[PDB]
Design a protein around this ligand. Structure first.
Ligand SMILES: *[C@@H]1O[C@H](CO)[C@@H](O)[C@H](O)[C@H]1NC(C)=O
Ligand SMILES: *[C@@H]1O[C@H](CO)[C@@H](O)[C@H](O)[C@H]1NC(C)=O
Length: 142
C-alpha cells in the first residue's frame, strides 16, 4: 500500500494495480459487533481480508478504548490502540488490541485505517491472531 492507494500482491503482475480503499471495501451491517452487546454465540473474524466499512446500529467505527470481555459477539474483543485519521491523512497503520485475562492488549495485530470522502472510515483487516476475537464497533459513533 501507499499514501492513498492499496495495490496488488508484490512480485506479481498485479503489483502495479492500485485502488482507493474508500471505493472498494466489504460493507458490514452487523449490530452484534457493538461494544455494548453482551449476547450471542461467540464468533471470530478469522476469515476477514481486505478493506471493510462498518454501518448500522452497532456503530460506524472501531472503539478507541478497551472493550470489556465477552462483548461484540466474541470472547476477546478487539479495539483500536490509536487515533482515527482525518480526511487527507492517507492510509495509516495502527495496532489493534484484544482484551483478555486482565490484559487490554493480550493479543495484537496490525490494521490499516483510512478516512474517506463522505465522512466515513475504512479498515484493512487481515484475519485475527487467535479465536474467538472480533473487531468491535462503537455505537456511540452513529
Ligand atoms: C478490491 O480490493 C481487493 C483486495 O482487498 C482486490 O483483490 C480487488 O481487485 C479490488 N477491486 C477493485 C475493483 O479495485
Ligand atoms: C495504546 O494503548 C496504551 C494503553 O492505553 C497506551 O499507553 C498507548 O499510548 C496507546 N498507543 C496509541 C498509539 O494510542
Amino acid at each position: 500500500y501507499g499514501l492513498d492507494l492499496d495495490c496488488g500482491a508484490p512480485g506479481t503482475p498485479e503489483a502495479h494495480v492500485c485502488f482507493d480503499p474508500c471505493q472498494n471495501y466489504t460493507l458490514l451491517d452487523e449490530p452484534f459487533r457493538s461494544t455494548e452487546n453482551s449476547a450471542g454465540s461467540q464468533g471470530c473474524d478469522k476469515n476477514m481480508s481486505g478493506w471493510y466499512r462498518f454501518v448500522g446500529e452497532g456503530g460506524v467505527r472501531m472503539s478507541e478504548t478497551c472493550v470489556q470481555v465477552h462483548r461484540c459477539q466474541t470472547d476477546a474483543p478487539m479495539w483500536l490502540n490509536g487515533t482515527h485519521p482525518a480526511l487527507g491523512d492517507g492510509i495509516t497503520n495502527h495496532t489493534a488490541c484484544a482484551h483478555w485475562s486482565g490484559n487490554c492488549c493480550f493479543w495484537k495485530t496490525e490494521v490499516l485505517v483510512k478516512a474517506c470522502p463522505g465522512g466515513y472510515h475504512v479498515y484493512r483487516l487481515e484475519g485475527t491472531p487467535w479465536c474467538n476475537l472480533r473487531y468491535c464497533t462503537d455505537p456511540s459513533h452513529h
